[PDB]
Amino acid sequence: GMTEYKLVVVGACGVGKSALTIQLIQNHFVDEYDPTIEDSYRKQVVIDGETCLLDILDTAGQEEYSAMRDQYMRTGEGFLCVFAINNTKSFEDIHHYREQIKRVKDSEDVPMVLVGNKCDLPSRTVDTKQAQDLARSYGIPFIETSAKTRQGVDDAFYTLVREIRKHK
Amino acid sequence: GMTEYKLVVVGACGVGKSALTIQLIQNHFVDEYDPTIEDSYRKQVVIDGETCLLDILDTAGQEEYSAMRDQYMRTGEGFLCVFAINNTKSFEDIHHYREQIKRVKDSEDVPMVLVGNKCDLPSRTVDTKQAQDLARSYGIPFIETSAKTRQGVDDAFYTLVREIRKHKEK
Amino acid sequence: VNPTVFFDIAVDGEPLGRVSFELFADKVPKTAENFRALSTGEKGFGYKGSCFHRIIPGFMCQGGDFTRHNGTGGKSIYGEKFEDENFILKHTGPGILSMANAGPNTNGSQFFICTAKTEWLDGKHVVFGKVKEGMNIVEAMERFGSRNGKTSKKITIADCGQL
Amino acid sequence: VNPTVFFDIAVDGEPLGRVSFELFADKVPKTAENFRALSTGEKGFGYKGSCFHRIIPGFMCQGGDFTRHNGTGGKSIYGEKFEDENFILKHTGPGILSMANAGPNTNGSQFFICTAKTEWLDGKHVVFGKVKEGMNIVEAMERFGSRNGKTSKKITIADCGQL
Numbered sequence: 001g002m003t004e005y006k007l008v009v010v011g012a013c014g015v016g017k018s019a020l021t022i023q024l025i026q027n028h029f030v031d032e033y034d035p036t037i038e039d040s041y042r043k044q045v046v047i048d049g050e051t052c053l054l055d056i057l058d059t060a061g062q063e064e065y066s067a068m069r070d071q072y073m074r075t076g077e078g079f080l081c082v083f084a085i086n087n088t089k090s091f092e093d094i095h096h097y098r099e100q101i102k103r104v105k106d107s108e109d110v111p112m113v114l115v116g117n118k119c120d121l122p123s124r125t126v127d128t129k130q131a132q133d134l135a136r137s138y139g140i141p142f143i144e145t146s147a148k149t150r151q152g153v154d155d156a157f158y159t160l161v162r163e164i165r166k167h168k
Numbered sequence: 169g170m171t172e173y174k175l176v177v178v179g180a181c182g183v184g185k186s187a188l189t190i191q192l193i194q195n196h197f198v199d200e201y202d203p204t205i206e207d208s209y210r211k212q213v214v215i216d217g218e219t220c221l222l223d224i225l226d227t228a229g230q231e232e233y234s235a236m237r238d239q240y241m242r243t244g245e246g247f248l249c250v251f252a253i254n255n256t257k258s259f260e261d262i263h264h265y266r267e268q269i270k271r272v273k274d275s276e277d278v279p280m281v282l283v284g285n286k287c288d289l290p291s292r293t294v295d296t297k298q299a300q301d302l303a304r305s306y307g308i309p310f311i312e313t314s315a316k317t318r319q320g321v322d323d324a325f326y327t328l329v330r331e332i333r334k335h336k337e338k
Numbered sequence: 339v340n341p342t343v344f345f346d347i348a349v350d351g352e353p354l355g356r357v358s359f360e361l362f363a364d365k366v367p368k369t370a371e372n373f374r375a376l377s378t379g380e381k382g383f384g385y386k387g388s389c390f391h392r393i394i395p396g397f398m399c400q401g402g403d404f405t406r407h408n409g410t411g412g413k414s415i416y417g418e419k420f421e422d423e424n425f426i427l428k429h430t431g432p433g434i435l436s437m438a439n440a441g442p443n444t445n446g447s448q449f450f451i452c453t454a455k456t457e458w459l460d461g462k463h464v465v466f467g468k469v470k471e472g473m474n475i476v477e478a479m480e481r482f483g484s485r486n487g488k489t490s491k492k493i494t495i496a497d498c499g500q501l
Numbered sequence: 502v503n504p505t506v507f508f509d510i511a512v513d514g515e516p517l518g519r520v521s522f523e524l525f526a527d528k529v530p531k532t533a534e535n536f537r538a539l540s541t542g543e544k545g546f547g548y549k550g551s552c553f554h555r556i557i558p559g560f561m562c563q564g565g566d567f568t569r570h571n572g573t574g575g576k577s578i579y580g581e582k583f584e585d586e587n588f589i590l591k592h593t594g595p596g597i598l599s600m601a602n603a604g605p606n607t608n609g610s611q612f613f614i615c616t617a618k619t620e621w622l623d624g625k626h627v628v629f630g631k632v633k634e635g636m637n638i639v640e641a642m643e644r645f646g647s648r649n650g651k652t653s654k655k656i657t658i659a660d661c662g663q664l
């Protein structure tokens with residue numbers, strides 16, 4: 001039987017968490033904004049020779065529901081931390097999501113990947129350099145993505161699977 | 169907010185786990201056989217003057233997957249152990265479900281209710297006193313139900329909630 | 339005076355019953371008027387035929403997307419969005435009628451009906467009415483909701499207007 | 502020579518592609534003939550228009566209920582149900598085509614296509630065919646399944662027949 005990985009996508013509202021997830025699952029791009037309550041996805045893939053089953057939880061980034069996120073963070077093995085490169089606020093929230101993850105998991109060593117999404121847009125307020133420096137500080141990979149063009153999507157999720165594999 | 173109760177319905181195939189759950193949720197009777205993979209439901213009810221949120225997990229009873237009941241048994245707060253009063257094997261399977269629940273939770277003290285379903289049927293092979301005696305020995309309530317007539321449906325789920333309230337000392 | 343409107347609710351096309359609402363035009367006139375006009379269709383568009391796309395038992399029933407019928411659309415009689423009129427009224431219990439939104443000042447046509455106290459929404463969603471008659475119909479709609487709101491049968495506003 | 506049949510698949514009415522199956526009439530002639538006839542519709546009923554009601558990524562896509570369209574029904578050309586013909590062939594990997602059932606000797610019209618090896622189903626479900634062309638169509642169908650099998654889109658056999 002194929003091994004199962006439990007991924008959790010986190011980040012502020014509107015950054016493209018669901019659009020990235022839907023692009024990975026369905027090869028489809030959601031051009032409309034359907035804010036997430038909570039959705040779980042299943043997908044089988046072959047990564048580095050190992051066939052595996054990805055269980056992906058797509059979460060809501062609303063601040064009022066922080067206490068609920070704790071349960072997402074207990075069960076999840078790895079965390080895709082998404083901000084939008086035209087949204088400086090969502091970039092600043094990353095620090096808070098990471099802190100919460102670190103706390104709930106009681107560990108500085110939790111598989112994680114920083115994702116700067118919407119890299120197709122001509123406007124940009126978060127430089128690649130800033131996000132590199134932040135990821136380097138945290139000790140985690142950094143990938144720039146565009147769910148609109150499909151750029152970097154597979155890399156982001158598979159890199160996270162690899163970080164869990166390395167961690168386990 | 170309202171207190172949420174995590175209820176899990178367990179028992180052999182075909183005893184009426186899904187029929188009972190659907191009567192609770194939708195107040196009608198599935199007369200056709202749709203064998204369950206896994207289904208979760210939500211319903212708010214008033215029990216003893218208090219409003220509470222029920223989270224019902226309807227499970228698969230297939231023997232082929234008995235070694236995977238571990239996950240849902242660990243997170244459930246209370247268990248409806250269902251047999252059909254016209255199927256002795258389903259009654260004898262109860263012992264196995266209860267033991268497996270006790271093992272997974274590593275506790276002899278788990279909120280449960282014994283449910284004897286299909287009591288509208290004339291072809292009973294398990295006597296009421298038979299099941300009463302077993303529940304007495306388990307120290308749990310016993311309720312006879314019919315998903316077809318709705319007899320005891322509310323009573324079974326509400327009694328489980330009351331059992332959970334007790335075990336929590338609240 | 340506060341006007342009253344009704345939805346005639348159907349389940350997979352089968353009539354379920356009528357819900358009526360009192361609209362608090364005396365505290366949120368702009369928001370009440372919008373919902374009133376969308377219920378009569380007098381502007382040429384509105385709730386008739388739209389569906390309740392999100393029903394989460396124990397919390398609320400949400401609908402009102404008549405432009406896209408997928409939970410992302412809707413529009414007000416004032417344009418695509420209008421401002422938060424105020425937050426005088428709160429989500430005190432079942433029957434409260436309030437505006438859905440996607441951040442401050444993004445009210446359109448989407449609305450929700452509380453089935454319980456949702457006080458963490460106070461100050462963020464504009465309450466503008468309450469169920470007058472037919473709360474039992476709202477409770478019945480919860481029969482077809484789920485934890486994440488996806489419905490198991492199509493709940494529609496088969497008819498609606500002003501009383 | 503073993504017969505070959507085809508499904509033209511559609512997602513919410515939009516073509517996805519064609520998948521073809523070899524039916525192993527040489528080892529399971531009775532079970533293969535039932536699938537062939539239901540694929541042509543020649544007995545006056547069959548798979549055309551029916552949906553794939555259960556898709557679980559990592560395991561299989563299940564369909565074939567053309568009498569109730571909810572996963573409880575289906576019928577064979579020999580009656581509602583017929584006996585297990587034999588269990589000679591195994592669920593060896595993706596593309597295997599095999600009969601759904603509700604226990605021994607309850608074969609109807611429901612079938613499943615494996616997207617993986619499912620060895621524990623050997624001796625319990627009758628294997629009677631194999632995807633010939635369009636495995637990638639079946640894999641694409643997985644994109645709309647879920648853990649408990651509920652599909653996020655309507656996956657239909659828009660057309661089918663014998664080649």
Ligand SMILES: CCn1c(-c2cc(N3CCN(C4CC4)CC3)cnc2[C@H](C)OC)c2c3cc(ccc31)-c1csc(n1)C[C@H](NC(=O)[C@H]1[C@@H]3COC[C@@H]31)C(=O)N1CCC[C@H](N1)C(=O)OCC(C)(C)C2
Binds near residue numbers: 035065069397487
């Ligand atoms: C963390 C899980 N979780 C919960 C929640 C929370 C709790 N409690 C909170 C309170 N605690 C007490 C302090 C102790 C205990 C824990 C329990 N269980 C749950 C649920 C069942 O677990 C999945 C929710 C919730 C809500 C969202 C996302 C996740 C959520 C969400 C997304 S977008 C939005 N909310 C506003 C949305 N906007 C649009 O739809 C936009 C579309 C496009 O542009 C127009 C249109 C909108 O206006 N409404 C109209 C109003 C109610 C609102 N939707 C909604 O559905 O809330 C659902 C719910 C269940 C009430 C809240």
Ligand SMILES: CCn1c(-c2cc(N3CCN(C4CC4)CC3)cnc2[C@H](C)OC)c2c3cc(ccc31)-c1csc(n1)C[C@H](NC(=O)[C@H]1[C@@H]3COC[C@@H]31)C(=O)N1CCC[C@H](N1)C(=O)OCC(C)(C)C2
Binds near residue numbers: 202228573621648
């Ligand atoms: C415990 C959870 N769980 C799993 C399962 C299991 C595993 N593995 C098991 C195997 N290990 C390997 C050796 C190591 C690893 C762990 C992982 N994750 C899961 C899932 C996703 O956790 C939610 C399943 C499964 C299956 C059932 C109930 C629960 C199940 C179930 C109900 S009825 C049936 N099965 C037979 C059914 N009959 C009808 O539909 C009747 C209807 C009416 O009359 C005509 C018609 C039928 O014939 N088929 C045609 C064939 C595939 C089959 N459906 C089906 O869908 O199985 C799904 C699935 C995922 C393959 C199995």
Ligand SMILES: Nc1nc2c(ncn2[C@@H]2O[C@H](COP(=O)(O)OP(=O)(O)NP(=O)(O)O)[C@@H](O)[C@H]2O)c(=O)[nH]1
Binds near residue numbers: 012146
């Ligand atoms: N230009 C561009 N737009 C994008 C991209 N990804 C998503 N969008 C758009 O941005 C909006 C937000 O998308 P969504 O994926 O729905 O966001 P979320 O980050 O999951 N939000 P929530 O936490 O509220 O559930 C949608 O309109 C979507 O189409 C991208 O890579 N590029």
Ligand SMILES: Nc1nc2c(ncn2[C@@H]2O[C@H](COP(=O)(O)OP(=O)(O)NP(=O)(O)O)[C@@H](O)[C@H]2O)c(=O)[nH]1
Binds near residue numbers: 227229
């Ligand atoms: N007369 C009668 N029939 C019932 C009753 N409860 C269920 N049935 C019937 O018994 C059959 C099996 O019922 P179901 O609810 O599907 O069972 P389960 O216990 O959930 N089974 P599984 O483990 O396979 O998912 C169905 O035909 C159903 O209508 C009852 O109280 N009375």
Ligand SMILES: [Mg+2]
Binds near residue numbers: 034035036
């Ligand atoms: Mg989202």
Ligand SMILES: [Mg+2]
Binds near residue numbers: 185187202203226227
């Ligand atoms: Mg069942």
